[PDB]
Design a protein around this nucleic acid. Sequence first.
RNA 1: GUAAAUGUGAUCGAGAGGGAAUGAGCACUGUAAUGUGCACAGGAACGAGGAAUUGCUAGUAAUCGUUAUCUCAUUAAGAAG
Lengths: 144, 117, 192, 76, 65, 100, 142
Amino acid sequence: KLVFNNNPLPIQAMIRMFNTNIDGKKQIIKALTTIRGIGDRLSLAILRRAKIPTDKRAGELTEDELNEINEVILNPQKYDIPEWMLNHQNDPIDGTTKHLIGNQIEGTIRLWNERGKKIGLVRAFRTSLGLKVRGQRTKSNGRG
Amino acid sequence: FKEFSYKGVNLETLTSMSISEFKELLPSKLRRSINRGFSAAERDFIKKCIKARSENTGLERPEQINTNTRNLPILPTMIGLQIGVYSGRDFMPMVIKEEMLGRRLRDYVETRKLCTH
Amino acid sequence: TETSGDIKLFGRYPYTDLEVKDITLEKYINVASKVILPHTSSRLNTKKFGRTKIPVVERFVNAMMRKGRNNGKKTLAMRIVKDAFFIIEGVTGQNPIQILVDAICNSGPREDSARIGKGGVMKRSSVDVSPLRRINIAIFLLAKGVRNSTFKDIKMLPEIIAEELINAAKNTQSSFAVKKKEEIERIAKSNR
Amino acid sequence: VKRHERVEDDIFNKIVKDVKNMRILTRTTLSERYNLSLNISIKLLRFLEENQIIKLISSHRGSKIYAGSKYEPLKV
Amino acid sequence: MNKQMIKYNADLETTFTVERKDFGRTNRRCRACFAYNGVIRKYDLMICRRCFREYAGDIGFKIYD
Amino acid sequence: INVELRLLCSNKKLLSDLSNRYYNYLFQNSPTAKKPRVLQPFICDVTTRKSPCGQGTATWSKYKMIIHGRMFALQMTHQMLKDSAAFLQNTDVEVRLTLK
Amino acid sequence: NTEIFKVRHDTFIPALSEYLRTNKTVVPIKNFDIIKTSRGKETSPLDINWYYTRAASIIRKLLISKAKNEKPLSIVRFSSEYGCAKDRGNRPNKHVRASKGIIIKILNDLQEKGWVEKKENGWTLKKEAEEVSKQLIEKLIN
RNA sequence: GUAAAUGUGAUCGAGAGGGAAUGAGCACUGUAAUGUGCACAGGAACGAGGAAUUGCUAGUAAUCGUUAUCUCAUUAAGAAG
Ligand SMILES: [K+]
Ligand SMILES: [Mg+2]
Ligand SMILES: [Mg+2]
Ligand SMILES: [Mg+2]
Ligand SMILES: [Zn+2]
């Protein structure tokens, strides 16, 4: 009898990367947009340096494929992803550039805003009260 | 505990750098202001700061320096000084602490009182 | 390319031996005018019964350029109906054109409700529809049924066109257009 | 229940038996009769049209229509 | 007039001169009435929309259509 | 030999009269005479609100000034150019010359 | 004769693309796998070989320009040809040009292979680039 | 900065629709950024709108872009074409 020979592999329901859960049925691109700090654009960048076919689903990936992606997230600058692609450029505290993942984002924004408030930076005071800081008009819109 | 740092540089080195060198650290819009050269007003303000840091000794505070140079970025030469910035009505006093580097003097003073209905 | 013969609709369909099969409708349904593609710019709208001389499948594609966002997209409408005719010709086994004709015949309500009272309060009553209005409403209902059916459903739009038109031609309860024709006629009778 | 991302052997077997005697068939039928997603109704349908089990009758833009063993067209 | 300003470099010792560009309302006053608002600048007129309509027929403009 | 004479004018009746007068002069000398070429008119325009304040329905007016023009290209000897140029004065029409 | 018009564009652009890649006549820009073609585009191209489809379509623009005897093509002209409608949030969409850097690199690659000659007011074809196209078409239509 | 809807092929599959508040940056105009452009992150309401209410009869309505038009150093989600 004939056989299909074009079927996906036996698939797992969901998997863990980053203290984050990824739906195994979801195709790798929109699936890596679950981890904070991996947007659409950067998700495609990582996958083509780890060299994984974009059309596989997240639950088909081996441990090996998940290590390849895990390695590229901890150190993008090793696999020729240039610094203008990354979250945190010319860090005031370190001089360096780095890519913040998961809960590091909120923690870094907090420690930053808190420092400005300790010394009375007007920009940090407004964000704490729920006000706007990019010059937007606050009379007509943005109520409640 | 570690020394204060701005974009990689220690306060010891930073307080010794020329304005020309410090310019390689600052944000883009602040760099463009230093590239386009200082006004005659700004030069007097800066020369007074350099004089003051030199002149002051012991435990007594130096006198306040007043300015209407609102857009000037803060420089490592006016650290520890008391400076009055014009608010459109009065010279609002402040002390220039290390953490203010990379910002303009207008960023630390309100020209408009906060509203509570 | 495909043919060097006589004019057929989409270069595929016979364009002959067509019967209306309701004498009340005869003069108002153009299945004469041989056209290769359901598109014409013929400027008949500026006339007294000129919108009754436009060919049948033309009137039927115009009905699709709706829901606001699709205004003016007449190529898209032709693409859609082309496919529907393939589905229907297959399913039914007869010229898609006779399915379309019979859909119209069944789907027009014959009696309607209207205000008659002039010299006082306006009291509703039954009234009898003209040939022309009867067919105008048939197209309207067939279109409205299709549009709303497809909105947030996984099925393809050309397929929904084939579902409705077969059923309508066969006068089945299954058609949205046929049901609503029953409703209008029942209310008309209630106010008789 | 949600849709599926495989055509397992026993669904595959019975689809071959079901595709004969059907007339026009389309992406939706495989995905609304059986439990397959649109992304696996395309791949199976394309496979059967290489195997000569079905035949394609339209492919205009993305709108794509097929026929099975008891199709028969009009005649002049 | 093209006014000039002195500016000091980062050394606060060397000086250079830069020119102020003529822009904004300050030099585009209405040639009939000195107004700063509603000045038509096209075809090298420099006349306000109020003054234009009383003089238009003397200049040679007409409403054809 | 050749001359091209541009008659330029922001009044139509004048340009029509002066060109008819010059055409008559050409045909009276008979050097194989011809009509002028009617040029694309230059049209400068301004659009402004009618009211001197904000009140009322905003009503707008378009003023346009039309500079008509006519070209004669012609064959003459240098004396006839020098002598005929006495015709080209005391006109509201502006007159310009080209030569090769 | 104007030999190019005898075949369909969606068969010609894919056809030449293979002849380019199998001879490496054009070399990808650094980071071609993650760069976008314009600031108007939403994401980088779906085909990894997009750089070669650009090279294949650039020589087509030049063949038809030569066929109609137009003035030579400039870097600005090509940038407006490949342009698109940029998305701007809460504002109408607006027409924006393609990025020049890709186009400059392709034209400099083609110069080194002797396929494109720089004129004072634009770029132009050369005999080898014409004859490659000629010999392709003569098989492709048959 | 010299159209866009649009035409063919692929793709995606029922919040991969949507881009609001916000982060550290990279440039431009300017006497001065507070204004504008760009890249990366982030991802709010909204699943077709109560009582009411506004235009429009044919190359019209609605859709789609564009202004060597006006404002204009730099700024259009405005008018006038
Ligand atoms: K509002
Ligand atoms: Mg969008
Ligand atoms: Mg989106
Ligand atoms: Mg206004
Ligand atoms: Zn005036």
